[PDB]
Write a protein that binds this ligand. Structure first.
Ligand SMILES: CC(C)CCC[C@@H](C)[C@H]1CC[C@H]2[C@@H]3CC=C4C[C@@H](O)CC[C@]4(C)[C@H]3CC[C@]12C
Ligand SMILES: CC(C)CCC[C@@H](C)[C@H]1CC[C@H]2[C@@H]3CC=C4C[C@@H](O)CC[C@]4(C)[C@H]3CC[C@]12C
Lengths: 196, 196
């Protein structure tokens, strides 16, 4: 777990990444993973089991939970991290492949593919930010929700588990994601400026 | 409870009633009352409380019982006895009123009103027989019924209490009612024949 080994691993052995991309982006990425790990099973572990509705209708609990939580926040963030990390993984594999072929026997190609990688990383961050806004308007969760989907008769009151703690972690993850967007834009601008 | 007192009470102090109307009709009427008394609270006492359906839907028990038993057999027979007994009560009151006014101070009127009374008694018997057939086709009740009325989901199985015992008493009451119809027709025919 040598510091130089961890730095080499996270940097992806890329010769075009700048200081921000090799230090700040990696740290914020680690921060999001650690927050997600400590908050996934602990806070969102009983999201559905503890979800109850004030009714005697069989199946109203499950249908109301599905109505109000089409996809859990933890899974949404997990997908966001995987999708955001994919272009970095592709660049690392491409660099390793180039090292392999040159050992068996370019700089502009590496520069261009890195820039495209950062652009796609920024694009994925923006898309997931918009999707999160679309599914869950606002940032705070409420204790009581009004559910009227079939088979629930009329409108029933359903209660969410730990809405305040989930709100706190939602703010943390959203703030970290916003910082990643800002750093990605700065990285793109810095690369373009240095290219001239 | 002197026998002559009971006979005078049941006959209605009528001078036109024949032997069948004063003996057989009264006995069958007493028979129906006694059968109804012993079978009302004992057999049909738990008709709704013991009625259960194989479902978790709240309210499906009550709605299914109402669907399959719009009116209980005991109440239907109770109404039949009251309605059948009404023309006899009217004739008895009219006879008493005539006695009252003559004491204060006709035979054809008494004869005609008695004949009309028997005709209406026969008519009420026939109507209730038809209504019983209309609400409960056949004579035997079944242990299991298929109920699909709202709010019950799809079709549910509901179970009736004491369907065999209720079937036995249904046959008894129906047979007694049929005998009353036959005796009433015989009474009308005999009166018409004797009138000539
Ligand atoms: C600058 C930032 C974005 C760098 C992010 C680096 C991420 C994308 C890289 C760094 C090291 C990578 C890991 C290296 C090895 C493995 C083992 C493999 O069997 C599963 C994937 C897994 C666990 C990789 C997941 C992606 C990973 C964590
Ligand atoms: C030949 C057949 C049909 C005769 C039938 C006689 C029936 C209709 C008559 C005979 C005596 C009557 C009862 C005489 C007195 C009373 C008391 C009153 O406060 C309520 C009704 C009640 C209880 C009457 C109900 C009707 C009754 C039972």
């Amino acid at each position: 777990m040598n510091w130089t080994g961890l730095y080499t691993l996270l940097s992806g052995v890329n010769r075009h990444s700048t200081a921000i991309g090799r230090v700040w982006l990696s740290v914020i990425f680690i921060f999001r993973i650690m927050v997600l790990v400590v908050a996934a099973e602990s806070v969102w572990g009983d999201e559905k089991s503890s979800f109850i509705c004030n009714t005697l209708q069989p199946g109203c609990n499950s249908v109301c939970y599905d109505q109000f939580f089409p996809i859990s926040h933890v899974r949404l963030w997990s997908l966001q991290l995987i999708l955001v990390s994919t272009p970095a993984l592709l660049v690392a594999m491409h660099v390793a492949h180039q090292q392999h072929i040159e050992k068996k026997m370019i700089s502009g190609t590496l520069w261009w593919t890195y820039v495209i990688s950062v652009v796609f990383r920024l694009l994925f961050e923006a898309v997931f930010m918009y999707v999160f806004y679309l599914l869950y308007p606002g940032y705070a969760m409420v204790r009581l929700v009004k559910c009227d989907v079939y088979p629930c008769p009329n409108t029933v009151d359903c209660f969410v588990s730990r809405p305040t703690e989930k709100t706190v972690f939602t703010v943390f993850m959203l703030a970290a994601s916003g910082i990643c967007i800002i750093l990605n834009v700065a990285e793109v601008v810095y690369l373009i400026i240095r290219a001239c």
